[PDB]
Coordinates of C-alpha atoms in Angstrom, one line a residue:
Chain U
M1 CA 17.7 18.0 18.2
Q2 CA 15.5 19.4 21.1
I3 CA 15.2 23.2 21.2
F4 CA 13.0 25.3 23.5
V5 CA 10.6 28.1 22.7
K6 CA 9.6 30.3 25.7
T7 CA 7.0 33.1 25.7
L8 CA 6.3 36.2 27.7
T9 CA 3.8 34.5 30.1
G10 CA 6.6 32.1 31.3
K11 CA 5.7 28.9 29.5
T12 CA 8.5 26.8 27.9
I13 CA 7.8 24.6 24.9
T14 CA 10.1 21.7 24.0
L15 CA 10.3 20.9 20.3
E16 CA 12.3 18.1 18.6
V17 CA 13.4 19.5 15.3
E18 CA 16.4 19.2 13.0
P19 CA 19.2 21.8 12.1
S20 CA 17.9 21.8 8.5
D21 CA 14.3 22.6 9.3
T22 CA 13.0 25.8 7.9
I23 CA 11.3 28.4 10.0
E24 CA 8.0 27.8 8.4
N25 CA 8.4 24.2 9.6
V26 CA 9.1 25.1 13.2
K27 CA 6.1 27.5 13.1
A28 CA 4.0 24.6 11.8
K29 CA 5.1 22.4 14.7
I30 CA 4.1 25.2 17.2
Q31 CA 0.7 25.3 15.6
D32 CA 0.4 21.6 15.7
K33 CA 1.0 21.2 19.5
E34 CA -0.1 24.6 20.7
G35 CA -2.9 25.7 18.4
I36 CA -1.7 29.2 17.6
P37 CA -1.6 29.8 13.8
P38 CA 1.7 30.7 12.1
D39 CA 0.5 34.2 11.3
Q40 CA 0.4 35.0 15.0
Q41 CA 3.9 33.7 15.6
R42 CA 7.2 35.7 15.7
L43 CA 10.4 33.8 16.6
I44 CA 13.2 35.7 18.3
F45 CA 16.8 34.4 18.7
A46 CA 19.5 36.5 20.3
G47 CA 17.4 39.6 19.7
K48 CA 17.3 38.8 16.0
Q49 CA 13.9 38.0 14.5
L50 CA 13.8 34.8 12.5
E51 CA 13.1 35.3 8.8
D52 CA 10.9 32.7 7.2
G53 CA 12.7 30.7 4.5
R54 CA 16.0 30.1 6.3
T55 CA 17.2 26.9 8.1
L56 CA 18.1 26.8 11.7
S57 CA 21.7 26.3 10.7
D58 CA 21.7 29.7 9.1
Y59 CA 21.2 31.2 12.6
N60 CA 23.6 28.7 14.2
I61 CA 21.0 27.2 16.4
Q62 CA 22.7 24.5 18.5
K63 CA 20.7 21.9 20.4
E64 CA 18.9 23.0 23.6
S65 CA 19.0 26.6 22.1
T66 CA 16.1 28.5 23.7
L67 CA 14.0 30.5 21.3
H68 CA 11.4 33.2 22.2
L69 CA 7.9 33.5 20.8
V70 CA 5.8 36.7 20.8
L71 CA 2.2 36.8 19.5
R72 CA 0.9 39.1 16.7
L73 CA -2.5 40.2 17.9
Chain H
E4 CA -5.8 -5.9 17.6
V5 CA -6.4 -3.0 15.2
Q6 CA -7.6 -3.6 11.7
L7 CA -9.5 -1.8 8.9
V8 CA -12.1 -3.8 6.9
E9 CA -13.2 -2.3 3.6
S10 CA -16.4 -2.8 1.5
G11 CA -18.5 -1.2 -1.2
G12 CA -16.2 -1.9 -4.2
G13 CA -17.3 -3.6 -7.4
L14 CA -18.3 -2.9 -10.9
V15 CA -20.2 0.3 -11.9
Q16 CA -21.0 2.0 -15.2
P17 CA -19.3 5.4 -15.9
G18 CA -21.4 8.1 -14.3
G19 CA -22.7 5.7 -11.6
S20 CA -22.3 5.9 -7.9
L21 CA -20.5 3.8 -5.3
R22 CA -20.1 4.1 -1.5
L23 CA -16.9 2.6 -0.1
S24 CA -17.1 1.8 3.7
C25 CA -14.2 1.2 6.1
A26 CA -15.1 -0.6 9.2
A27 CA -12.7 0.1 12.0
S28 CA -11.8 -2.0 15.0
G29 CA -9.3 -1.5 17.9
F30 CA -9.4 2.3 17.9
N31 CA -11.9 5.2 17.7
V32 CA -12.4 7.0 14.4
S33 CA -13.7 10.0 16.3
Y34 CA -10.1 10.5 17.6
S35 CA -8.0 9.3 14.7
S36 CA -7.5 10.4 11.0
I37 CA -8.6 8.2 8.1
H38 CA -7.4 8.7 4.6
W39 CA -8.1 7.1 1.2
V40 CA -5.4 6.0 -1.3
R41 CA -6.0 4.5 -4.7
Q42 CA -3.7 2.6 -7.0
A43 CA -4.6 2.4 -10.7
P44 CA -3.6 -0.8 -12.6
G45 CA 0.1 -0.5 -13.4
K46 CA 0.4 2.8 -11.6
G47 CA 1.5 4.0 -8.2
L48 CA -0.3 5.2 -5.0
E49 CA -2.4 8.4 -5.3
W50 CA -3.9 10.1 -2.3
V51 CA -7.7 10.5 -2.6
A52 CA -9.3 12.2 0.5
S53 CA -8.8 12.5 4.3
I54 CA -10.8 13.2 7.4
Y55 CA -9.8 14.6 10.8
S56 CA -13.0 13.4 12.6
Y57 CA -12.1 15.1 15.8
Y58 CA -12.7 18.5 14.2
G59 CA -14.6 17.5 11.0
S60 CA -11.9 18.6 8.5
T61 CA -12.1 17.0 5.1
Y62 CA -9.7 17.4 2.3
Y63 CA -9.6 16.2 -1.3
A64 CA -7.4 16.0 -4.4
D65 CA -8.0 18.2 -7.4
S66 CA -8.8 15.1 -9.5
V67 CA -11.8 14.1 -7.3
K68 CA -13.0 17.4 -6.0
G69 CA -16.7 17.9 -6.3
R70 CA -17.3 14.3 -7.2
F71 CA -16.2 12.4 -4.0
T72 CA -17.7 13.0 -0.6
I73 CA -15.8 11.6 2.4
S74 CA -17.6 11.1 5.7
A75 CA -17.3 9.3 9.0
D76 CA -19.9 7.7 11.2
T77 CA -18.8 7.6 14.8
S78 CA -21.6 5.4 16.0
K79 CA -20.5 2.4 13.9
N80 CA -16.8 3.4 13.8
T81 CA -16.8 3.6 10.0
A82 CA -15.4 6.1 7.4
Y83 CA -17.2 6.4 4.1
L84 CA -16.2 7.6 0.7
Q85 CA -19.2 8.5 -1.6
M86 CA -18.0 8.4 -5.2
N87 CA -20.2 10.1 -7.7
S88 CA -19.9 10.7 -11.5
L89 CA -17.3 8.0 -11.8
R90 CA -15.1 8.0 -14.9
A91 CA -12.9 5.4 -16.5
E92 CA -9.7 7.0 -14.9
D93 CA -11.2 6.1 -11.5
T94 CA -10.6 2.3 -11.9
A95 CA -8.1 1.5 -9.1
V96 CA -7.6 -0.4 -5.9
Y97 CA -8.8 2.0 -3.2
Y98 CA -7.2 1.6 0.2
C99 CA -8.3 2.8 3.7
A100 CA -5.5 3.9 6.0
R101 CA -5.3 5.4 9.4
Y102 CA -3.0 8.4 9.9
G103 CA -1.6 9.3 13.3
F104 CA 1.0 8.4 16.0
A105 CA 3.2 5.6 14.9
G106 CA 5.1 4.7 18.1
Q107 CA 8.1 7.0 19.0
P108 CA 7.4 10.2 20.9
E109 CA 8.1 13.6 19.2
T110 CA 7.8 12.1 15.7
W111 CA 5.7 13.0 12.7
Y112 CA 2.6 11.0 12.1
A113 CA 2.3 8.4 9.4
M114 CA -0.1 5.9 8.0
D115 CA 0.5 2.8 10.2
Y116 CA -2.4 0.5 9.4
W117 CA -4.1 -0.1 6.0
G118 CA -7.1 -2.0 4.8
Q119 CA -6.9 -5.0 2.5
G120 CA -8.0 -2.9 -0.5
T121 CA -11.2 -3.0 -2.6
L122 CA -11.3 -2.8 -6.4
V123 CA -13.5 -0.3 -8.1
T124 CA -13.9 -1.0 -11.9
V125 CA -15.7 1.6 -14.1
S126 CA -16.6 0.6 -17.6
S127 CA -19.8 0.0 -19.7
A128 CA -19.1 -3.7 -20.1
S129 CA -21.5 -5.9 -18.1
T130 CA -20.5 -8.7 -15.7
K131 CA -19.4 -12.0 -17.3
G132 CA -18.9 -15.4 -15.5
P133 CA -15.6 -17.2 -15.9
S134 CA -15.4 -20.4 -17.9
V135 CA -12.7 -22.7 -16.6
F136 CA -11.0 -25.1 -19.0
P137 CA -8.4 -27.7 -17.9
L138 CA -4.8 -27.9 -18.9
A139 CA -4.4 -31.6 -19.2
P140 CA -1.0 -33.1 -18.5
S141 CA 0.2 -34.9 -21.6
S142 CA 3.4 -36.2 -23.1
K143 CA 4.5 -32.6 -23.9
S144 CA 4.0 -31.3 -20.3
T145 CA 6.1 -34.0 -18.7
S146 CA 9.9 -33.8 -18.2
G147 CA 10.8 -37.1 -16.6
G148 CA 9.8 -37.0 -13.0
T149 CA 7.6 -33.9 -12.8
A150 CA 4.3 -33.3 -14.7
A151 CA 2.9 -29.8 -15.2
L152 CA -0.9 -29.4 -15.2
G153 CA -3.2 -26.5 -14.6
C154 CA -6.4 -24.6 -15.2
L155 CA -7.4 -22.0 -17.8
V156 CA -9.9 -19.4 -16.5
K157 CA -11.0 -17.7 -19.7
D158 CA -13.2 -14.7 -20.4
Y159 CA -14.5 -13.1 -17.2
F160 CA -15.3 -9.6 -16.1
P161 CA -14.5 -7.8 -14.0
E162 CA -11.5 -8.6 -11.7
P163 CA -10.7 -10.5 -9.6
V164 CA -10.8 -14.3 -9.4
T165 CA -9.3 -16.7 -6.9
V166 CA -7.8 -20.0 -8.0
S167 CA -7.1 -22.7 -5.5
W168 CA -6.2 -26.4 -5.8
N169 CA -7.8 -29.3 -3.9
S170 CA -9.7 -26.7 -1.8
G171 CA -6.3 -25.4 -0.5
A172 CA -4.7 -28.8 0.2
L173 CA -2.3 -28.2 -2.8
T174 CA -0.3 -25.0 -2.3
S175 CA 3.1 -26.4 -3.1
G176 CA 4.4 -25.5 -6.5
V177 CA 1.4 -23.6 -7.8
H178 CA 2.0 -20.5 -10.0
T179 CA -1.1 -18.4 -10.6
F180 CA -0.5 -15.8 -13.3
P181 CA -1.8 -12.2 -13.3
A182 CA -4.9 -11.4 -15.4
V183 CA -4.5 -10.2 -19.0
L184 CA -7.1 -8.1 -20.7
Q185 CA -7.8 -9.9 -23.9
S186 CA -8.6 -8.1 -27.2
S187 CA -12.2 -9.0 -26.7
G188 CA -12.4 -6.9 -23.5
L189 CA -12.4 -9.8 -21.1
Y190 CA -9.8 -11.1 -18.7
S191 CA -8.1 -14.4 -18.9
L192 CA -6.0 -16.2 -16.1
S193 CA -4.1 -19.4 -16.1
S194 CA -2.9 -21.3 -13.0
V195 CA -0.5 -24.3 -13.3
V196 CA 1.0 -26.6 -10.7
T197 CA 3.8 -29.2 -11.0
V198 CA 3.1 -32.6 -9.5
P199 CA 5.0 -35.9 -9.5
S200 CA 4.3 -38.1 -12.6
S201 CA 3.6 -41.1 -10.4
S202 CA 0.5 -39.4 -9.1
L203 CA -1.5 -38.7 -12.3
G204 CA -3.4 -42.0 -12.3
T205 CA -4.0 -42.4 -8.5
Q206 CA -4.4 -38.9 -7.2
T207 CA -7.0 -36.3 -8.3
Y208 CA -6.3 -32.7 -9.0
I209 CA -9.2 -30.3 -8.9
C210 CA -8.8 -26.5 -9.3
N211 CA -11.2 -24.3 -7.4
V212 CA -12.1 -21.0 -9.1
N213 CA -14.0 -18.3 -7.3
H214 CA -15.5 -15.2 -8.9
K215 CA -17.4 -12.9 -6.5
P216 CA -18.4 -10.1 -9.0
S217 CA -20.6 -12.7 -10.8
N218 CA -21.2 -15.0 -7.7
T219 CA -19.7 -17.9 -9.7
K220 CA -17.8 -20.8 -8.1
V221 CA -16.2 -23.3 -10.5
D222 CA -14.4 -26.6 -9.5
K223 CA -12.7 -28.1 -12.6
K224 CA -11.1 -31.5 -12.4
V225 CA -7.9 -31.9 -14.4
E226 CA -7.0 -35.3 -15.7
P227 CA -4.4 -36.4 -18.3
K228 CA -5.2 -36.3 -22.0
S229 CA -6.9 -39.3 -23.6
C230 CA -8.4 -40.3 -26.9
Chain B
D2 CA 1.8 21.5 -4.2
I3 CA 4.7 19.4 -3.0
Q4 CA 5.8 16.4 -5.1
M5 CA 8.3 13.7 -4.3
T6 CA 10.8 12.5 -6.9
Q7 CA 12.2 9.0 -6.4
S8 CA 15.5 7.7 -7.9
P9 CA 16.1 5.2 -9.3
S10 CA 12.9 3.7 -10.8
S11 CA 14.2 0.1 -10.6
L12 CA 17.0 -1.7 -8.9
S13 CA 18.5 -5.2 -8.9
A14 CA 21.0 -6.4 -6.3
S15 CA 22.1 -9.8 -5.0
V16 CA 21.3 -11.2 -1.6
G17 CA 23.3 -9.3 1.1
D18 CA 23.8 -6.1 -0.9
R19 CA 23.1 -2.7 0.6
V20 CA 20.6 -0.8 -1.6
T21 CA 19.7 2.9 -1.2
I22 CA 16.6 4.7 -2.6
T23 CA 16.7 8.5 -3.1
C24 CA 13.6 10.6 -2.5
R25 CA 13.8 14.3 -3.3
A26 CA 11.2 16.7 -1.9
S27 CA 9.7 19.6 -3.8
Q28 CA 9.5 22.1 -0.9
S29 CA 10.8 21.8 2.7
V30 CA 8.9 18.9 4.3
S31 CA 10.9 18.7 7.6
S32 CA 10.9 15.1 8.8
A33 CA 7.3 14.4 7.7
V34 CA 8.3 11.6 5.3
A35 CA 7.4 7.9 5.6
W36 CA 8.5 4.9 3.6
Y37 CA 6.1 2.1 2.6
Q38 CA 6.5 -1.3 1.1
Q39 CA 3.9 -2.9 -1.2
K40 CA 4.4 -6.5 -1.9
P41 CA 2.6 -7.8 -5.1
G42 CA -1.1 -8.4 -4.4
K43 CA -1.0 -6.9 -0.9
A44 CA -1.6 -3.5 0.8
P45 CA 1.3 -1.1 1.4
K46 CA 3.0 -1.7 4.8
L47 CA 4.7 1.0 6.8
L48 CA 8.5 0.6 7.2
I49 CA 10.2 3.9 8.2
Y50 CA 8.2 6.8 9.5
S51 CA 9.1 10.3 10.5
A52 CA 12.1 10.4 8.1
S53 CA 14.1 7.9 10.1
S54 CA 12.1 6.2 12.8
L55 CA 11.6 2.4 12.5
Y56 CA 8.1 1.0 12.9
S57 CA 7.3 -1.9 15.3
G58 CA 7.5 -5.2 13.4
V59 CA 9.8 -4.1 10.5
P60 CA 13.2 -5.8 10.4
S61 CA 16.1 -3.7 11.6
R62 CA 17.8 -3.9 8.2
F63 CA 15.5 -1.2 7.0
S64 CA 16.5 2.3 7.9
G65 CA 15.7 5.9 6.9
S66 CA 17.7 9.1 6.9
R67 CA 17.2 12.8 6.2
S68 CA 19.5 15.5 4.9
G69 CA 17.6 18.7 3.8
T70 CA 14.9 17.9 1.3
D71 CA 16.5 14.5 0.4
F72 CA 15.5 11.2 2.0
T73 CA 17.2 7.8 1.6
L74 CA 15.8 4.4 2.3
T75 CA 18.5 1.7 2.8
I76 CA 18.3 -2.0 3.3
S77 CA 21.4 -3.8 4.7
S78 CA 20.7 -7.5 4.2
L79 CA 18.6 -7.7 1.0
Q80 CA 16.5 -10.8 1.4
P81 CA 14.4 -12.6 -1.3
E82 CA 11.2 -11.5 0.4
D83 CA 12.1 -7.8 -0.2
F84 CA 10.9 -7.9 -3.8
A85 CA 8.3 -5.2 -3.8
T86 CA 7.7 -1.5 -4.7
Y87 CA 8.7 1.2 -2.2
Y88 CA 7.1 4.6 -2.0
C89 CA 8.2 7.6 0.0
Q90 CA 5.3 9.7 1.3
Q91 CA 4.9 13.4 2.0
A92 CA 2.7 14.0 5.1
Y93 CA 3.4 17.7 5.7
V94 CA 0.8 19.7 3.6
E95 CA -2.5 18.0 3.4
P96 CA -2.5 17.3 -0.4
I97 CA -0.5 14.2 0.4
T98 CA 1.8 13.1 -2.4
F99 CA 3.7 9.9 -2.8
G100 CA 6.9 9.1 -4.7
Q101 CA 6.9 7.5 -8.1
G102 CA 8.0 4.2 -6.6
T103 CA 11.0 1.9 -6.8
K104 CA 10.7 -1.8 -7.8
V105 CA 13.5 -3.8 -6.3
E106 CA 14.2 -7.3 -7.6
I107 CA 16.7 -9.9 -6.3
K108 CA 19.7 -10.6 -8.5
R109 CA 20.1 -14.3 -8.8
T110 CA 22.2 -16.9 -10.7
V111 CA 20.9 -17.4 -14.2
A112 CA 18.4 -20.3 -14.3
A113 CA 17.1 -21.9 -17.5
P114 CA 13.3 -22.3 -17.9
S115 CA 11.7 -25.7 -18.1
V116 CA 9.1 -25.0 -20.9
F117 CA 5.9 -27.0 -21.1
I118 CA 3.0 -26.8 -23.7
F119 CA -0.7 -27.6 -23.4
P120 CA -3.0 -28.3 -26.3
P121 CA -6.6 -27.0 -26.0
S122 CA -8.9 -29.2 -24.1
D123 CA -11.9 -31.0 -25.5
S124 CA -14.1 -29.0 -23.1
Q125 CA -12.9 -25.8 -24.7
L126 CA -13.4 -27.2 -28.3
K127 CA -17.0 -27.8 -27.4
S128 CA -17.5 -24.1 -26.6
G129 CA -16.0 -23.1 -30.0
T130 CA -12.6 -21.7 -29.1
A131 CA -9.1 -23.3 -28.9
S132 CA -6.2 -21.7 -26.8
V133 CA -2.7 -23.1 -26.6
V134 CA -0.7 -22.0 -23.6
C135 CA 3.1 -22.2 -23.4
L136 CA 4.4 -22.4 -19.8
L137 CA 7.9 -21.2 -18.8
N138 CA 8.6 -22.4 -15.3
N139 CA 11.1 -21.0 -12.8
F140 CA 13.7 -19.0 -14.6
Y141 CA 15.9 -15.9 -14.3
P142 CA 16.3 -13.2 -15.5
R143 CA 12.8 -11.9 -16.4
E144 CA 13.8 -11.2 -20.0
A145 CA 12.3 -14.0 -22.2
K146 CA 11.2 -14.2 -25.8
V147 CA 8.3 -16.5 -26.8
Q148 CA 7.7 -17.0 -30.5
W149 CA 4.6 -18.9 -31.6
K150 CA 4.8 -20.9 -34.9
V151 CA 1.9 -22.7 -36.6
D152 CA 3.1 -24.9 -39.5
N153 CA 6.4 -23.0 -39.3
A154 CA 4.5 -19.9 -40.1
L155 CA 5.1 -17.3 -37.4
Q156 CA 2.0 -15.8 -35.7
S157 CA 1.6 -12.0 -35.1
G158 CA -1.2 -11.0 -32.8
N159 CA -3.6 -13.2 -30.9
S160 CA -0.9 -13.9 -28.3
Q161 CA -1.4 -12.8 -24.7
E162 CA 1.5 -13.2 -22.3
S163 CA 1.8 -12.6 -18.6
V164 CA 4.7 -12.9 -16.1
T165 CA 4.4 -13.6 -12.5
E166 CA 6.0 -11.7 -9.6
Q167 CA 9.5 -12.8 -8.6
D168 CA 9.1 -15.7 -6.1
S169 CA 9.7 -14.8 -2.4
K170 CA 11.6 -18.1 -1.9
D171 CA 13.6 -19.1 -5.1
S172 CA 13.6 -15.6 -6.7
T173 CA 12.5 -16.9 -10.1
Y174 CA 9.9 -15.9 -12.6
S175 CA 7.3 -17.7 -14.7
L176 CA 5.8 -16.8 -18.1
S177 CA 2.4 -17.8 -19.5
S178 CA 2.0 -17.3 -23.2
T179 CA -1.4 -18.3 -24.6
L180 CA -2.3 -18.5 -28.3
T181 CA -6.1 -18.0 -28.6
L182 CA -7.5 -19.4 -31.8
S183 CA -10.9 -20.4 -33.1
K184 CA -12.1 -24.1 -33.1
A185 CA -12.4 -24.3 -36.9
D186 CA -9.1 -22.4 -37.2
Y187 CA -7.5 -25.0 -34.9
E188 CA -8.7 -27.8 -37.1
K189 CA -7.1 -26.1 -40.2
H190 CA -3.6 -26.6 -38.9
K191 CA -1.5 -29.6 -37.7
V192 CA 1.7 -28.5 -35.9
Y193 CA 1.8 -25.8 -33.2
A194 CA 5.2 -24.8 -32.0
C195 CA 6.5 -22.6 -29.1
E196 CA 10.1 -21.2 -29.4
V197 CA 11.7 -19.8 -26.3
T198 CA 14.8 -17.5 -26.4
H199 CA 16.4 -17.0 -23.0
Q200 CA 19.8 -16.0 -21.6
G201 CA 20.3 -19.3 -19.8
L202 CA 19.6 -21.1 -23.1
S203 CA 22.5 -21.8 -25.4
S204 CA 20.0 -22.4 -28.3
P205 CA 16.3 -21.7 -28.7
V206 CA 14.3 -24.5 -27.3
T207 CA 11.2 -25.4 -29.4
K208 CA 8.3 -27.4 -28.0
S209 CA 5.8 -28.5 -30.6
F210 CA 2.9 -30.9 -30.7
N211 CA 0.6 -32.4 -33.4
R212 CA -3.2 -31.8 -33.4
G213 CA -5.3 -34.6 -32.1
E214 CA -2.5 -36.6 -30.4
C215 CA -0.9 -36.5 -27.0
Chain K
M1 CA -9.2 13.7 44.0
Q2 CA -10.9 13.5 40.6
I3 CA -11.0 16.0 37.7
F4 CA -13.2 16.2 34.6
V5 CA -11.8 15.8 31.0
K6 CA -14.1 17.0 28.3
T7 CA -13.5 16.3 24.6
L8 CA -14.7 17.9 21.4
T9 CA -17.0 14.9 20.6
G10 CA -19.0 15.3 23.8
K11 CA -17.3 12.6 25.8
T12 CA -16.9 13.6 29.5
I13 CA -14.5 11.3 31.5
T14 CA -13.9 12.0 35.2
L15 CA -10.4 10.7 36.0
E16 CA -9.2 10.1 39.5
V17 CA -5.8 11.8 39.8
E18 CA -3.5 13.4 42.4
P19 CA -1.8 16.8 42.6
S20 CA 1.6 15.1 42.4
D21 CA 0.7 13.3 39.1
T22 CA 2.6 14.6 36.2
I23 CA 0.9 15.6 33.0
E24 CA 2.5 12.7 31.2
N25 CA 0.8 10.4 33.7
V26 CA -2.7 11.9 33.4
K27 CA -2.3 11.6 29.6
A28 CA -1.3 7.9 30.1
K29 CA -4.4 7.4 32.2
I30 CA -6.6 8.8 29.3
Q31 CA -5.4 6.3 26.7
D32 CA -6.4 3.5 29.0
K33 CA -10.0 5.0 28.7
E34 CA -10.1 6.0 25.1
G35 CA -6.9 4.9 23.3
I36 CA -5.5 8.3 22.3
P37 CA -1.7 8.2 22.5
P38 CA -0.2 10.7 24.9
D39 CA 1.6 12.5 22.1
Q40 CA -1.7 13.5 20.5
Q41 CA -3.3 14.7 23.7
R42 CA -3.3 18.4 24.3
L43 CA -4.8 19.3 27.7
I44 CA -6.1 22.8 28.1
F45 CA -6.8 24.3 31.6
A46 CA -7.9 28.0 32.1
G47 CA -6.7 28.9 28.6
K48 CA -3.3 27.4 29.1
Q49 CA -1.8 24.2 27.8
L50 CA -0.3 21.9 30.4
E51 CA 3.3 21.1 29.7
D52 CA 4.4 17.5 29.5
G53 CA 6.9 17.9 32.4
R54 CA 5.2 19.7 35.2
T55 CA 2.6 18.3 37.6
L56 CA -1.0 19.5 37.7
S57 CA -0.2 21.0 41.1
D58 CA 2.1 23.5 39.4
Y59 CA -1.0 24.9 37.7
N60 CA -3.0 24.9 41.0
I61 CA -5.6 22.5 39.6
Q62 CA -8.1 21.7 42.3
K63 CA -10.7 18.9 42.6
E64 CA -13.7 18.9 40.3
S65 CA -11.6 21.0 37.8
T66 CA -12.3 20.6 34.1
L67 CA -9.7 19.8 31.4
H68 CA -10.2 20.2 27.7
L69 CA -8.8 17.6 25.2
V70 CA -7.3 18.8 21.9
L71 CA -5.6 16.4 19.4
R72 CA -2.6 17.1 17.2
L73 CA -2.7 16.4 13.5
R74 CA 0.9 15.9 12.3
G75 CA 3.2 15.5 15.3
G76 CA 6.9 16.2 15.4

């Protein structure tokens, strides 16, 4: 499924993931197509911060669900 | 229109060095990733090393770290694998594969194209040329209409050999068997072909044996047994 | 690291059957899993990449699927040219690891072998050795028992056998059993027999010759 | 108008484009010159990566502007 990850600058990032992908995986895909390492990534969904080690189904992330990314610098 | 041609393989004593090359055509090595995968005799595929030539990243497996050096020359579009301090456990068919985009957008990358594979053999035994003996069709290798004949490529080292028939004009019904490591430390291979019995006196069957490790070419004529 | 675990190790299904191959991943790999086919004597070819995407040139009967850390390769119409070994790959973390492999053979009607025998040539007797090869041609299944007998005295050792890969057309095997002997040892005996025990054989077929005549 | 595309291996290609050209089209015009598939190409302009949907006029890219090429490693 295709989810979106928007930042604070205003850029939207389209990712094609699966409901069973772990959060370390979706952070690896962001690094692969955007260059930012996973340590500088922090994913937010409905105000809740995504905890590494849980699938997207644990947070009930439907398709086209927009995530938010904030950098750690 | 894209292919990978390998070279550098052969025979080498334990502790010796070998440099495998991987000539590339149809793409740019400076923009793609090239890996090495080996397959030991009777074993599966093991990853060796990898290069991401765009950034210069090289990675290795714990079994070849410090001994193998992987490199890539962009000028001649070739990726190299300098193997040093070779051991017996390194004897395998080394493959050259490209890793990258495989067709469908938003999909993970995979190894799409591979080389034909080169064989690295590591042992202290020297090179030995193959001696080819005929398997003459007799009254015991005939079952009415058909008659089985063949060639016996005995005692050669190392692998591989190539056994043809009539310079390729006899590919129908030929069964070339895999190589067996004899108790004397040398390989032995037999290739047989079934032909009509009404052709043993008129037609001629010559088996062509090719051995590149010893630069030996043998053409043995097979004719029926006589007194 | 991350290691794949394939199951089962070997399969055998008839033409038209649907066979599945399980590949279980160590850690979470996402969809970074590719399936490869290695025919005997050839390089591994890419079949299904990115967990389930089909590669250009691969028949549509091959398919992949993902469910968590488990991946299944499935073939709908199993054809005779699908005899090979299949490896799932992990292309997530850079220490790339493959699966153990899965050799798939075609299940065929039982065929009896036509056994031939070859005395040593005169060219080989000049070099000082004498090898007798017993040839089992076009049979199924692969399980065969060759038993060399010299003057009705069974021979242990000095016997090298080799089977060929299952044929991509008739799905049959071939066995080459050679009895390597010395020249003078070959002159010491008279009768050389080759007994073949097979499933498609109601009784053991024995093919024997006499030294010096053919 | 034409813009510059610089790569990490020193290759400088000047590609004739248009402000209405999408980023998917300028990537498609790069594989015709080098062979890199559009999914691997990451175009960088003024410290920002051009998204695959917008046009290069949404980023106010002018003539004789330089783009930097970055390649993905895994995809997906």
